Write a protein that binds this ligand. Structure first.
Ligand SMILES: Nc1nc2c(ncn2[C@@H]2O[C@H](COP(=O)(O)OP(=O)(O)O)[C@@H](O)[C@H]2O)c(=O)[nH]1
Ligand SMILES: [Mg+2]
Length: 201
């Protein structure tokens, strides 16, 4: 009878930015993933547990290394939300963000979108906070991320659940089982970066 609250999420951005690494941190979603042969995609079911009940994000991760413009319409059709990703050690991935946005909005129009800057465990960072107080001003929320250490993993999913359910006080009551950190996210470096965003804001 009474079914599941489920949302289609489309994960997009340049080849090599860490999209498959980020979505694979949720272990039960990787083990139960579904290979949809004909659209070139892997659909991952990520269940999150809130104070108002359980929610599911059906994350569509492309299986190729496609280029801006080269994602069929079927990949985006009926999407309810999205995450756009770039790598902070490569400037060309961040310059392509606007074209990935243009592709989404043409097919889906006004849907809640989060912007993510990955690989902030690396010391030699090229794209900093002062240049990210830019683009995000499309009604787009920004978060610094590190996929291999699990740094800020829940933040993009918590922001999208608040918009789609309609409650700004919604919280997660327990965290999903996650793959153990494989790199070190220095604790004083993370604090320096957070201070930099507030300065930039
Ligand atoms: N150190 C580090 N490397 C990362 C991180 N995220 C991705 N990478 C590396 O980037 C390469 C490409 O990642 P992949 O997930 O295949 O990217 P995709 O093309 O967007 O699917 C891999 O060798 C990853 O291990 C991160 O958080 N930290
Ligand atoms: Mg991939």
């Amino acid at each position: 009878g009474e079914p599941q609250v489920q949302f289609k999420l489309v994960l997009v951005g340049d080849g090599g930015t860490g999209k498959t690494t980020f979505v694979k941190r949720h272990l039960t979603g990787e083990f139960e993933k579904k290979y949809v042969a004909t659209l070139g995609v892997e659909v991952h079911p990520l269940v999150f547990h809130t104070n108002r009940g359980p929610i599911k994000f059906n994350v569509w991760d492309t299986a190729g290394l496609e280029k801006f413009g080269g994602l069929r319409d079927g990949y985006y059709i009926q999407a309810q939300c999205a995450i756009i990703m770039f790598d902070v050690t490569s400037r060309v991935t961040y310059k392509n963000v606007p074209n990935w946005h243009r592709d989404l909005v043409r097919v889906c129009e006004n849907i809640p979108i989060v912007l993510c800057g990955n690989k902030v465990d690396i010391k030699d960072r090229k794209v900093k906070a002062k240049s990210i107080v830019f683009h995000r001003k499309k009604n787009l929320q920004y978060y610094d991320i590190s996929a291999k250490s699990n740094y800020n993993f829940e933040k993009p999913f918590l922001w999208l659940a608040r918009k789609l359910i309609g409650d700004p006080n919604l919280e997660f009551v327990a965290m999903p089982a996650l793959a153990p950190p494989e790199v070190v996210m220095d604790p004083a470096l993370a604090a320096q970066y957070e201070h930099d965003l507030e300065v930039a804001q």
